[PDB]
Coordinates of C-alpha atoms in Angstrom, one line a residue:
Chain A
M22 CA 58.8 -6.7 -41.3
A23 CA 59.7 -9.6 -43.6
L24 CA 56.7 -10.3 -46.3
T25 CA 57.3 -11.8 -49.1
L26 CA 55.1 -11.0 -52.3
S27 CA 53.7 -13.6 -55.0
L28 CA 51.5 -14.1 -57.2
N29 CA 48.8 -15.4 -57.8
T30 CA 48.4 -17.1 -61.3
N31 CA 44.2 -16.4 -62.1
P32 CA 45.1 -14.2 -65.3
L33 CA 47.6 -16.7 -66.6
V34 CA 45.7 -19.9 -67.0
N35 CA 44.5 -20.9 -70.7
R36 CA 47.0 -17.9 -71.5
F37 CA 50.0 -20.4 -71.2
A38 CA 49.1 -24.1 -70.6
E39 CA 52.5 -26.1 -70.9
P40 CA 55.1 -26.2 -67.5
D41 CA 58.6 -24.4 -68.7
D42 CA 56.6 -21.7 -70.9
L43 CA 54.0 -20.7 -67.5
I44 CA 57.0 -20.9 -65.4
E45 CA 60.2 -19.1 -67.7
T46 CA 58.3 -16.5 -68.3
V47 CA 57.2 -15.9 -64.8
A48 CA 60.7 -15.7 -64.1
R49 CA 62.4 -13.5 -67.8
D50 CA 59.1 -11.5 -67.9
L51 CA 57.4 -10.3 -64.4
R52 CA 61.0 -11.1 -62.4
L53 CA 59.0 -12.5 -59.2
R54 CA 60.5 -15.1 -56.7
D55 CA 56.4 -16.8 -55.4
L56 CA 53.8 -18.4 -56.8
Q57 CA 50.1 -18.8 -56.0
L58 CA 49.5 -22.2 -58.1
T59 CA 45.5 -22.2 -59.4
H60 CA 45.1 -26.0 -60.0
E61 CA 44.2 -25.8 -63.9
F62 CA 47.4 -25.9 -64.5
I63 CA 48.8 -29.8 -63.4
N64 CA 44.4 -30.7 -62.0
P65 CA 43.6 -32.3 -59.0
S66 CA 41.1 -34.5 -61.7
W67 CA 43.4 -36.0 -64.6
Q68 CA 44.5 -39.6 -65.2
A69 CA 47.3 -40.1 -62.2
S70 CA 50.2 -40.8 -64.0
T71 CA 49.3 -37.0 -66.6
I72 CA 49.0 -35.6 -62.8
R73 CA 52.9 -37.5 -61.8
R74 CA 54.8 -36.3 -65.1
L75 CA 53.4 -32.7 -65.0
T76 CA 54.7 -32.5 -62.2
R77 CA 58.2 -33.4 -62.7
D78 CA 58.2 -31.1 -65.6
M79 CA 57.2 -28.0 -63.2
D80 CA 59.5 -29.2 -60.3
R81 CA 62.6 -29.2 -62.8
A82 CA 61.5 -26.2 -64.6
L83 CA 61.1 -24.3 -61.0
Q84 CA 64.2 -25.7 -60.0
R85 CA 66.5 -24.7 -63.0
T86 CA 64.2 -21.4 -62.7
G87 CA 65.1 -20.1 -59.3
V88 CA 61.4 -19.6 -59.1
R89 CA 58.8 -21.2 -56.4
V90 CA 56.0 -22.4 -55.5
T91 CA 54.5 -21.7 -52.2
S92 CA 51.1 -22.7 -51.7
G93 CA 48.2 -24.1 -53.9
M94 CA 44.9 -22.1 -55.1
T95 CA 41.6 -23.2 -57.4
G96 CA 41.6 -20.7 -59.6
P97 CA 38.9 -19.1 -61.6
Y98 CA 37.3 -22.7 -62.9
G99 CA 37.7 -23.8 -59.3
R100 CA 35.0 -21.6 -57.2
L101 CA 32.3 -24.0 -56.5
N102 CA 29.8 -25.5 -54.3
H103 CA 33.0 -28.2 -53.0
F104 CA 32.0 -28.9 -49.6
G105 CA 29.4 -27.0 -49.4
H106 CA 27.7 -29.9 -51.7
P107 CA 24.2 -30.9 -50.3
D108 CA 25.3 -34.7 -52.4
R109 CA 27.8 -37.4 -50.8
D110 CA 29.5 -37.9 -53.1
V111 CA 29.8 -35.2 -55.2
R112 CA 31.7 -34.2 -51.2
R113 CA 33.4 -37.3 -51.3
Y114 CA 35.0 -36.1 -55.4
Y115 CA 36.3 -33.2 -53.9
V116 CA 37.7 -34.0 -50.5
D117 CA 40.3 -36.9 -52.5
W118 CA 40.6 -34.2 -55.2
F119 CA 41.8 -31.6 -52.2
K120 CA 44.6 -34.9 -51.0
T121 CA 45.7 -34.9 -54.2
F122 CA 45.7 -30.9 -55.0
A123 CA 48.0 -30.8 -51.4
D124 CA 50.6 -34.0 -53.3
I125 CA 51.1 -31.9 -55.7
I126 CA 51.8 -29.1 -54.2
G127 CA 53.9 -31.3 -51.3
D128 CA 56.3 -32.5 -54.4
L129 CA 56.6 -28.9 -55.7
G130 CA 58.3 -27.5 -53.1
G131 CA 54.8 -25.5 -51.8
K132 CA 53.0 -24.8 -48.2
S133 CA 49.7 -24.5 -48.0
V134 CA 46.6 -25.8 -50.1
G135 CA 43.0 -23.8 -50.1
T136 CA 40.1 -22.3 -51.6
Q137 CA 36.6 -21.2 -50.6
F138 CA 35.4 -23.4 -47.0
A139 CA 32.6 -23.9 -49.6
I140 CA 29.6 -22.4 -51.1
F141 CA 26.1 -23.4 -50.0
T142 CA 23.3 -23.1 -52.8
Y143 CA 20.5 -20.6 -51.2
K144 CA 18.1 -23.4 -50.2
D145 CA 21.1 -24.8 -47.8
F146 CA 22.5 -21.5 -46.8
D147 CA 18.5 -20.0 -45.7
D148 CA 17.3 -22.5 -43.8
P149 CA 19.1 -21.8 -40.8
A150 CA 19.1 -25.8 -39.2
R151 CA 20.4 -26.5 -42.6
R152 CA 23.1 -24.2 -42.8
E153 CA 25.1 -25.3 -39.6
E154 CA 25.1 -28.6 -40.5
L155 CA 26.3 -28.5 -43.8
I156 CA 29.3 -26.2 -41.7
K157 CA 30.4 -28.8 -39.2
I158 CA 30.2 -31.3 -42.7
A159 CA 32.5 -28.6 -44.1
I160 CA 35.0 -29.3 -41.5
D161 CA 35.1 -32.9 -41.5
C162 CA 36.1 -32.4 -45.5
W163 CA 39.1 -30.2 -44.0
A164 CA 39.8 -32.1 -41.5
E165 CA 40.1 -35.3 -43.8
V166 CA 41.8 -33.1 -46.4
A167 CA 44.1 -31.5 -43.4
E168 CA 45.2 -35.5 -42.5
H169 CA 46.2 -36.0 -45.8
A170 CA 48.1 -33.1 -46.5
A171 CA 50.3 -33.2 -43.1
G172 CA 51.4 -37.0 -45.2
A173 CA 51.9 -34.6 -48.3
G174 CA 54.2 -32.3 -46.2
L175 CA 52.0 -29.1 -45.9
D176 CA 52.4 -26.7 -43.2
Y177 CA 48.8 -25.8 -43.5
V178 CA 45.5 -25.7 -45.1
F179 CA 43.3 -22.5 -45.7
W180 CA 39.9 -20.9 -46.5
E181 CA 39.5 -18.2 -48.4
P182 CA 36.6 -15.0 -46.6
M183 CA 34.4 -13.8 -49.5
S184 CA 31.4 -11.1 -50.4
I185 CA 27.9 -12.9 -49.5
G186 CA 26.9 -14.8 -46.5
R187 CA 26.4 -18.2 -48.4
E188 CA 30.5 -18.0 -49.3
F189 CA 30.9 -17.7 -45.7
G190 CA 33.7 -14.7 -43.9
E191 CA 31.6 -11.6 -45.2
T192 CA 31.8 -8.9 -42.5
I193 CA 35.3 -8.7 -40.7
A194 CA 33.2 -10.3 -37.6
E195 CA 31.8 -13.8 -38.9
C196 CA 35.2 -13.5 -40.6
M197 CA 36.9 -14.0 -37.6
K198 CA 34.2 -16.7 -36.4
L199 CA 34.2 -18.8 -38.4
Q200 CA 38.7 -19.2 -37.9
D201 CA 37.7 -19.3 -34.3
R202 CA 36.0 -22.1 -35.4
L203 CA 38.4 -23.7 -37.4
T204 CA 41.1 -23.6 -35.3
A205 CA 39.3 -25.4 -32.2
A206 CA 38.9 -28.2 -34.6
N207 CA 42.1 -29.0 -33.5
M208 CA 43.7 -30.2 -37.2
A209 CA 46.0 -32.4 -38.2
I210 CA 47.8 -28.9 -39.8
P211 CA 46.4 -25.9 -39.2
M212 CA 43.4 -24.3 -41.0
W213 CA 44.2 -20.5 -41.3
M214 CA 42.9 -18.5 -43.9
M215 CA 43.5 -15.9 -47.0
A216 CA 42.0 -13.0 -46.4
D217 CA 41.8 -10.9 -49.5
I218 CA 41.5 -7.1 -48.1
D219 CA 39.0 -5.8 -51.7
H220 CA 36.2 -9.1 -50.3
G221 CA 33.0 -8.3 -47.5
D222 CA 29.4 -7.1 -48.4
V223 CA 29.6 -3.9 -49.7
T224 CA 25.9 -4.3 -48.5
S225 CA 26.6 -4.0 -44.4
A226 CA 25.4 -1.3 -41.8
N227 CA 29.4 -1.4 -40.3
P228 CA 31.8 0.1 -42.4
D229 CA 34.5 -1.8 -42.1
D230 CA 33.6 -4.9 -43.8
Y231 CA 34.8 -3.4 -47.4
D232 CA 37.9 -1.0 -45.6
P233 CA 41.1 -2.7 -46.7
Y234 CA 42.5 -0.8 -44.1
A235 CA 40.2 -2.8 -41.4
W236 CA 40.5 -5.8 -43.2
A237 CA 44.6 -4.9 -42.7
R238 CA 44.4 -4.7 -39.7
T239 CA 42.4 -8.1 -38.4
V240 CA 44.4 -10.8 -40.1
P241 CA 47.6 -10.4 -40.2
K242 CA 48.2 -13.1 -37.4
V243 CA 45.6 -15.8 -38.9
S244 CA 46.3 -15.3 -42.2
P245 CA 49.6 -16.5 -43.9
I246 CA 49.2 -15.2 -47.5
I247 CA 47.5 -12.2 -48.1
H248 CA 45.6 -11.3 -51.5
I249 CA 46.0 -7.3 -52.2
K250 CA 43.6 -6.8 -55.7
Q251 CA 45.9 -4.1 -58.0
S252 CA 42.7 -2.7 -59.1
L253 CA 42.7 -1.7 -54.9
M254 CA 46.1 0.5 -55.8
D255 CA 46.5 4.6 -56.8
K256 CA 48.6 4.6 -60.2
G257 CA 49.6 8.4 -60.2
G258 CA 48.5 11.2 -61.6
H259 CA 45.7 11.7 -59.3
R260 CA 45.9 15.6 -57.1
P261 CA 46.5 14.7 -53.9
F262 CA 43.7 14.8 -50.9
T263 CA 41.5 13.9 -53.6
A264 CA 39.8 11.1 -52.9
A265 CA 39.8 8.8 -49.5
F266 CA 42.8 7.6 -48.5
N267 CA 40.7 4.0 -48.4
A268 CA 39.4 4.4 -51.6
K269 CA 39.4 1.8 -54.2
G270 CA 41.7 2.9 -56.8
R271 CA 43.2 5.2 -54.2
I272 CA 45.4 3.1 -51.7
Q273 CA 49.5 4.1 -51.6
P274 CA 51.3 0.6 -50.3
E275 CA 52.9 2.6 -47.9
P276 CA 50.9 3.5 -45.6
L277 CA 48.6 0.5 -46.1
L278 CA 52.1 -2.2 -45.1
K279 CA 51.3 0.2 -41.9
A280 CA 48.4 -0.9 -41.1
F281 CA 49.3 -4.7 -41.7
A282 CA 52.3 -4.1 -39.8
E283 CA 49.7 -2.5 -37.0
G284 CA 47.8 -5.8 -37.6
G285 CA 50.3 -7.7 -36.6
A286 CA 52.0 -8.7 -39.8
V287 CA 55.7 -9.5 -40.4
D288 CA 56.5 -12.5 -42.5
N289 CA 53.0 -12.7 -44.4
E290 CA 53.3 -13.5 -48.1
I291 CA 51.6 -10.5 -50.0
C292 CA 50.3 -12.4 -53.2
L293 CA 49.3 -10.3 -56.0
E294 CA 46.0 -10.3 -58.0
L295 CA 44.7 -9.5 -61.9
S296 CA 42.6 -10.4 -64.1
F297 CA 41.5 -9.6 -67.4
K298 CA 39.4 -9.8 -69.9
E299 CA 39.2 -12.0 -72.8
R300 CA 38.4 -8.9 -75.1
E301 CA 41.2 -6.2 -76.5
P302 CA 43.2 -4.9 -75.9
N303 CA 43.3 -6.4 -72.1
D304 CA 44.3 -9.6 -73.3
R305 CA 47.0 -8.5 -74.5
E306 CA 47.9 -6.8 -71.6
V307 CA 48.8 -9.8 -69.0
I308 CA 52.5 -9.5 -68.8
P309 CA 53.1 -6.2 -69.0
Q310 CA 50.7 -4.7 -66.6
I311 CA 51.5 -8.2 -64.1
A312 CA 55.5 -7.7 -64.3
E313 CA 54.0 -3.3 -63.6
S314 CA 52.2 -4.3 -60.3
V315 CA 56.0 -6.6 -59.5
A316 CA 58.0 -3.3 -59.7
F317 CA 54.8 -1.2 -58.2
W318 CA 55.6 -3.4 -55.2
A319 CA 59.9 -3.8 -55.6
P320 CA 60.4 -1.4 -52.5
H321 CA 58.4 -2.6 -50.6
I322 CA 58.1 -5.2 -51.0
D323 CA 61.8 -8.2 -52.6
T324 CA 60.0 -9.4 -55.6
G325 CA 62.7 -12.5 -54.7
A326 CA 64.3 -11.9 -57.6
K327 CA 67.7 -12.4 -56.0
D328 CA 67.1 -16.2 -56.2
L329 CA 66.3 -16.2 -60.1
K330 CA 68.7 -17.9 -61.6
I331 CA 67.4 -16.4 -65.8
Chain B
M22 CA 9.0 -18.1 -86.9
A23 CA 8.6 -20.9 -84.9
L24 CA 11.2 -19.9 -82.3
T25 CA 11.6 -21.0 -79.0
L26 CA 13.3 -19.6 -75.9
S27 CA 15.7 -21.8 -72.8
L28 CA 18.0 -20.7 -70.3
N29 CA 21.5 -20.9 -70.0
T30 CA 21.5 -21.9 -66.8
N31 CA 25.1 -20.3 -65.9
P32 CA 23.5 -17.7 -63.1
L33 CA 22.2 -20.4 -60.9
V34 CA 25.1 -22.5 -61.0
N35 CA 26.1 -22.8 -56.8
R36 CA 22.9 -21.3 -55.8
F37 CA 22.0 -24.6 -56.8
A38 CA 22.7 -28.2 -57.1
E39 CA 20.5 -30.4 -56.5
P40 CA 18.1 -31.6 -59.5
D41 CA 15.0 -31.2 -58.2
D42 CA 15.2 -27.8 -56.1
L43 CA 17.1 -27.2 -59.8
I44 CA 14.1 -28.3 -62.0
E45 CA 11.4 -27.1 -59.5
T46 CA 12.6 -23.5 -59.0
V47 CA 12.9 -23.3 -63.2
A48 CA 9.2 -24.6 -63.2
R49 CA 7.5 -22.3 -60.8
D50 CA 9.3 -19.5 -60.4
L51 CA 10.8 -19.1 -63.5
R52 CA 8.3 -20.2 -66.1
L53 CA 10.0 -21.6 -68.1
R54 CA 9.8 -24.8 -70.6
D55 CA 13.7 -25.4 -71.9
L56 CA 17.2 -25.1 -70.7
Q57 CA 21.0 -25.6 -71.7
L58 CA 22.4 -27.0 -68.8
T59 CA 25.2 -26.8 -67.9
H60 CA 28.3 -29.5 -67.2
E61 CA 28.7 -28.0 -63.1
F62 CA 25.3 -30.4 -62.0
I63 CA 26.3 -34.2 -63.4
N64 CA 29.9 -33.3 -63.3
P65 CA 31.2 -35.5 -66.4
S66 CA 34.7 -35.3 -64.2
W67 CA 31.9 -37.5 -60.7
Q68 CA 32.0 -41.1 -59.9
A69 CA 30.7 -43.3 -62.8
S70 CA 27.8 -43.9 -60.2
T71 CA 27.3 -40.5 -59.7
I72 CA 26.6 -39.2 -62.9
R73 CA 23.9 -42.3 -63.8
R74 CA 22.2 -42.0 -60.1
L75 CA 22.3 -37.8 -60.7
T76 CA 20.4 -38.3 -64.1
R77 CA 18.3 -40.9 -62.9
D78 CA 17.1 -38.1 -60.2
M79 CA 17.2 -34.9 -63.2
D80 CA 15.1 -37.4 -65.4
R81 CA 12.6 -37.2 -63.2
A82 CA 12.5 -34.1 -62.0
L83 CA 11.9 -33.0 -65.9
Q84 CA 8.6 -35.6 -66.5
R85 CA 7.7 -35.2 -63.6
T86 CA 7.4 -30.9 -64.1
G87 CA 7.3 -30.7 -67.8
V88 CA 11.4 -29.1 -67.8
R89 CA 12.9 -30.4 -71.1
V90 CA 16.7 -30.7 -70.8
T91 CA 17.7 -29.4 -75.1
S92 CA 21.4 -29.2 -75.2
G93 CA 24.0 -28.9 -72.5
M94 CA 26.7 -26.3 -72.2
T95 CA 30.5 -25.7 -70.6
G96 CA 29.3 -23.4 -67.1
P97 CA 31.0 -21.1 -66.2
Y98 CA 34.1 -23.6 -64.7
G99 CA 34.0 -25.3 -67.7
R100 CA 36.3 -22.2 -69.5
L101 CA 39.6 -24.2 -70.1
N102 CA 42.0 -25.0 -73.3
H103 CA 40.1 -28.3 -73.9
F104 CA 41.3 -29.0 -77.1
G105 CA 43.2 -26.6 -77.4
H106 CA 44.9 -27.8 -75.2
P107 CA 49.1 -28.2 -75.6
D108 CA 49.0 -31.6 -73.6
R109 CA 47.9 -35.4 -75.4
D110 CA 46.6 -36.8 -72.0
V111 CA 44.6 -33.8 -71.7
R112 CA 43.2 -33.5 -74.3
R113 CA 42.5 -36.9 -73.9
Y114 CA 40.9 -36.6 -70.6
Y115 CA 38.2 -33.5 -72.1
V116 CA 37.9 -35.7 -75.5
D117 CA 36.1 -38.3 -72.7
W118 CA 34.6 -35.5 -70.3
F119 CA 32.8 -34.3 -73.2
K120 CA 31.5 -37.9 -74.7
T121 CA 30.1 -39.2 -71.4
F122 CA 28.3 -34.9 -71.1
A123 CA 26.5 -36.2 -74.3
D124 CA 25.8 -39.9 -72.5
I125 CA 24.4 -36.7 -70.1
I126 CA 23.0 -34.9 -72.1
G127 CA 21.9 -37.9 -74.5
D128 CA 20.1 -39.2 -71.3
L129 CA 18.2 -36.1 -70.2
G130 CA 17.1 -36.3 -73.8
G131 CA 19.2 -32.7 -75.2
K132 CA 19.9 -33.4 -78.4
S133 CA 23.4 -31.3 -78.1
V134 CA 26.4 -30.6 -76.5
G135 CA 29.2 -27.8 -76.8
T136 CA 31.6 -25.2 -75.7
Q137 CA 34.5 -23.4 -77.6
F138 CA 35.7 -24.6 -80.8
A139 CA 38.7 -24.1 -78.1
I140 CA 41.1 -22.0 -76.8
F141 CA 44.8 -21.4 -77.8
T142 CA 47.6 -19.8 -75.7
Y143 CA 49.5 -17.4 -77.3
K144 CA 52.7 -20.0 -78.4
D145 CA 49.9 -22.0 -79.6
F146 CA 48.4 -19.2 -81.2
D147 CA 50.8 -17.2 -82.2
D148 CA 53.3 -19.2 -84.6
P149 CA 50.9 -19.6 -87.2
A150 CA 52.3 -22.8 -88.2
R151 CA 51.5 -24.7 -84.1
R152 CA 48.4 -22.5 -84.6
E153 CA 46.6 -24.4 -87.9
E154 CA 48.1 -27.9 -86.7
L155 CA 46.5 -27.5 -83.4
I156 CA 43.7 -26.6 -85.1
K157 CA 43.6 -29.5 -86.6
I158 CA 44.7 -31.1 -83.8
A159 CA 41.1 -30.1 -82.3
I160 CA 38.6 -30.7 -85.0
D161 CA 40.0 -34.4 -84.4
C162 CA 39.0 -34.4 -81.4
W163 CA 35.3 -33.0 -82.6
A164 CA 35.5 -36.1 -84.4
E165 CA 36.1 -38.1 -81.9
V166 CA 33.5 -36.9 -79.5
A167 CA 30.2 -36.3 -82.2
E168 CA 31.0 -40.1 -83.1
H169 CA 30.3 -40.9 -78.9
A170 CA 27.7 -38.3 -79.2
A171 CA 25.8 -39.6 -82.5
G172 CA 25.5 -42.9 -80.2
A173 CA 24.0 -41.2 -77.1
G174 CA 21.5 -39.9 -79.3
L175 CA 22.7 -36.5 -80.2
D176 CA 21.6 -34.4 -83.2
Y177 CA 24.4 -32.5 -83.3
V178 CA 27.3 -31.0 -81.1
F179 CA 28.8 -27.3 -80.9
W180 CA 30.9 -24.3 -80.9
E181 CA 30.9 -21.2 -79.4
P182 CA 32.9 -17.8 -80.8
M183 CA 34.2 -15.9 -78.5
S184 CA 36.1 -12.4 -79.1
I185 CA 39.7 -12.5 -79.2
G186 CA 42.0 -14.8 -82.1
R187 CA 42.5 -17.6 -80.0
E188 CA 39.5 -18.3 -78.5
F189 CA 37.7 -18.3 -82.3
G190 CA 35.5 -16.7 -84.2
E191 CA 35.9 -12.2 -82.8
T192 CA 34.9 -11.6 -86.7
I193 CA 31.5 -13.3 -88.1
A194 CA 34.0 -13.7 -91.8
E195 CA 36.5 -15.6 -89.3
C196 CA 33.8 -17.3 -87.7
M197 CA 32.1 -18.5 -91.1
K198 CA 35.5 -19.2 -92.0
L199 CA 35.1 -21.4 -89.1
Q200 CA 32.6 -23.9 -89.2
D201 CA 33.0 -23.6 -93.3
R202 CA 35.1 -25.9 -92.0
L203 CA 34.0 -28.0 -89.6
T204 CA 30.8 -28.5 -91.4
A205 CA 33.4 -29.8 -94.7
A206 CA 35.0 -32.0 -92.0
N207 CA 31.2 -34.4 -92.4
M208 CA 31.4 -35.5 -88.2
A209 CA 29.0 -38.9 -87.9
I210 CA 26.4 -36.1 -86.6
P211 CA 27.2 -32.1 -87.3
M212 CA 29.3 -30.0 -85.6
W213 CA 26.9 -26.3 -85.8
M214 CA 28.4 -22.9 -84.2
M215 CA 25.9 -21.5 -80.8
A216 CA 26.5 -17.8 -81.4
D217 CA 26.1 -15.4 -79.0
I218 CA 25.8 -12.2 -80.7
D219 CA 27.4 -9.8 -78.1
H220 CA 30.5 -11.4 -79.2
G221 CA 32.6 -10.0 -81.3
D222 CA 36.3 -8.9 -81.0
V223 CA 35.5 -4.6 -79.7
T224 CA 38.8 -3.7 -81.4
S225 CA 38.1 -5.0 -85.2
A226 CA 38.6 -2.1 -87.9
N227 CA 35.0 -3.7 -89.1
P228 CA 31.9 -2.5 -86.6
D229 CA 29.5 -5.5 -88.5
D230 CA 31.8 -7.5 -86.2
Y231 CA 30.6 -6.6 -82.9
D232 CA 27.6 -5.2 -83.6
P233 CA 24.8 -7.3 -82.2
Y234 CA 22.8 -7.4 -86.0
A235 CA 25.0 -8.1 -88.0
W236 CA 25.6 -11.4 -86.2
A237 CA 21.5 -11.9 -85.9
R238 CA 21.8 -11.6 -90.3
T239 CA 24.6 -13.3 -90.5
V240 CA 24.2 -16.9 -88.3
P241 CA 20.5 -18.5 -88.3
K242 CA 21.4 -21.1 -90.5
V243 CA 24.2 -22.7 -89.4
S244 CA 23.7 -21.8 -84.8
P245 CA 20.2 -24.0 -84.3
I246 CA 21.5 -22.0 -80.9
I247 CA 22.0 -18.4 -80.0
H248 CA 22.9 -16.9 -77.0
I249 CA 21.3 -13.4 -76.4
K250 CA 22.7 -10.9 -73.4
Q251 CA 19.6 -9.8 -72.1
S252 CA 21.4 -6.9 -70.5
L253 CA 21.9 -5.7 -73.7
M254 CA 17.7 -4.9 -74.5
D255 CA 16.4 -1.8 -73.3
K256 CA 15.0 -2.2 -70.6
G257 CA 12.1 0.6 -70.5
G258 CA 12.1 4.3 -69.8
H259 CA 14.1 6.1 -71.9
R260 CA 13.8 9.4 -74.3
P261 CA 12.9 7.0 -77.9
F262 CA 16.0 8.3 -80.4
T263 CA 18.7 9.0 -77.9
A264 CA 20.4 5.8 -78.8
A265 CA 22.0 4.1 -81.3
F266 CA 19.1 1.0 -82.6
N267 CA 22.2 -1.3 -81.9
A268 CA 23.5 0.4 -79.3
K269 CA 23.8 -2.4 -76.5
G270 CA 21.5 -2.1 -74.2
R271 CA 19.2 -0.2 -76.0
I272 CA 18.1 -2.6 -78.4
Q273 CA 14.8 -3.7 -79.0
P274 CA 13.6 -7.1 -79.1
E275 CA 11.0 -6.7 -82.3
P276 CA 13.6 -5.3 -84.3
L277 CA 15.8 -8.1 -83.4
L278 CA 13.9 -10.4 -83.3
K279 CA 13.1 -9.1 -88.7
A280 CA 16.9 -9.6 -88.6
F281 CA 17.1 -12.8 -87.0
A282 CA 14.1 -12.9 -89.5
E283 CA 16.0 -11.4 -92.5
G284 CA 19.2 -14.3 -91.3
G285 CA 16.2 -17.5 -92.1
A286 CA 15.6 -18.6 -88.6
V287 CA 12.7 -19.9 -88.7
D288 CA 13.5 -22.6 -85.6
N289 CA 16.4 -21.6 -83.8
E290 CA 16.2 -21.6 -80.3
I291 CA 16.9 -17.8 -77.9
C292 CA 18.6 -19.2 -75.1
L293 CA 18.6 -16.1 -72.5
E294 CA 22.1 -15.7 -71.1
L295 CA 22.4 -13.6 -67.6
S296 CA 25.8 -12.9 -64.7
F297 CA 24.9 -11.9 -61.1
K298 CA 27.9 -10.6 -59.8
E299 CA 28.8 -12.8 -55.8
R300 CA 27.8 -9.3 -54.0
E301 CA 24.6 -8.0 -53.1
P302 CA 22.4 -6.9 -54.1
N303 CA 23.2 -8.8 -56.7
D304 CA 23.6 -12.4 -56.0
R305 CA 19.6 -12.2 -54.2
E306 CA 18.4 -10.6 -58.0
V307 CA 18.7 -13.9 -60.3
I308 CA 14.9 -15.6 -60.2
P309 CA 13.1 -12.8 -60.5
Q310 CA 15.1 -10.6 -62.4
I311 CA 15.2 -14.3 -65.3
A312 CA 12.5 -14.1 -64.2
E313 CA 11.6 -10.5 -65.2
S314 CA 13.8 -11.8 -68.1
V315 CA 11.0 -14.7 -70.2
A316 CA 8.0 -12.6 -68.7
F317 CA 10.0 -10.2 -71.3
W318 CA 10.6 -12.4 -74.7
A319 CA 7.3 -13.9 -74.0
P320 CA 4.9 -12.2 -76.3
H321 CA 7.5 -12.2 -78.7
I322 CA 9.0 -16.1 -78.4
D323 CA 6.9 -18.7 -76.5
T324 CA 8.2 -20.2 -72.6
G325 CA 6.8 -23.8 -74.1
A326 CA 4.9 -22.6 -70.1
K327 CA 1.9 -24.8 -71.6
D328 CA 3.4 -27.7 -70.8
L329 CA 4.1 -27.0 -67.2
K330 CA 2.7 -30.0 -65.3
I331 CA 3.4 -27.6 -62.2

């Protein structure tokens, strides 16, 4: 395998804002090349000229440091209805918003952008006929974004499977059913998924649906980026065989990676996901623990630090 | 006391979107009059005409149902740097954003709008000179918003004290020090706080700083709205005196209210705060548990249901 390693910038939002500060900390303190940039740092809602100015700043910092933006994703403050919003003008706003997000990420050298497929209201989801009708509408929104993103130089767009019905793809079966549909839609550039192996409906009568190993074996050929929540991983100092191999908080990297391999992973980006409460001492454990997480994976997946210039 | 009762719409975001659906559910299912509307339902970022159309829709639903919007606050997807953003043009965007939020809330009959005072980056907060300089800048942003909001018919604007330094007001002392400053600034309409009695720096060497009773006794004269997290409250079926009276998860309404009274509360709005994970069965316990929370307070604080028309 030639996996690569990246970090979703979720936990760096608010705590960092200036591109130099963000990108120099990633390079110096995290020793990681690749990032999934979240929307909060250069927001598609802002004035067009502000976006351009900050994109130039960010691009200079990437070039100077050797850090790379490989994709864009909605951050913690972008988990919205979006293309599942029942208002036509609201949907239109977010279509144009995601078109600009694609422009930003393309400018920065990244190759894809995405978010949840959609998030439906109880009202829109619970009436199965309305649900299906809104799904067709949401697909057509994705299609529009994909066409613009092609022009911005992206390779694909993506959706993130979640853990309840109205946020989509909550079982492996539903997730692959939706993906089959988005592949068939034949967009200007392909639409793929970005699976999070910690996601899935925990109340499922199918234990696979919330088993990180089952997701690992299923997604790699349709999920170019794959999120791994670091909290899933064994931190050491437990007696061996005191928990299940697939117990969340006790998972080990070597066999997990083998599972991705059995799933047909060859050059997926493995994207680290961490969160820290805005309370002490958690708020000040962010850089140290992300650094630690990168060093955790470094023997298993190349971190790209050989390309850092500082 | 003539306290009133309201609900922050945080847990209704995503799950509801259409004004009729939102407001009719509040009236029929929650049996509550007053709401603190979050920004996600009518977003100040959207097209001007969309905002107007949705504000008219929302206002019709309030009039029809008897429900009232008494304030606006940033929802879960609005917890940003805002006036602590180090970029001048980003700050400008959010100033204008909050001006429109004030227009929306004023249109709807509400009397205030707010958010965190600011959220600072590590870089801006940790250099004490830069911190102070950015605080003056953030105050002047508030002043601009307050002047516009006066024109929109609001009575005041507000900040929410948080639980770490860089999010402001993390100890009672710091919170009252900042408030003294914002009062002195003499804005077009007053700037007050909206305290959350569950907030405060848990690592403080002062136990009062994360004691809901200490906040209760301190804030009422400077905090017209006060958030109460429902998870703080005793749900019943515990043996008496098996936990501290002020233990979070074991607090009782009668003595808490007495504490607010000792703090000089007369006609504060008590605003209920609840959250539900986007996982089952939590995602479908939202309406039932909010309904239950309202019925929990109803013997203690009038819910305003006498004014509901449906």
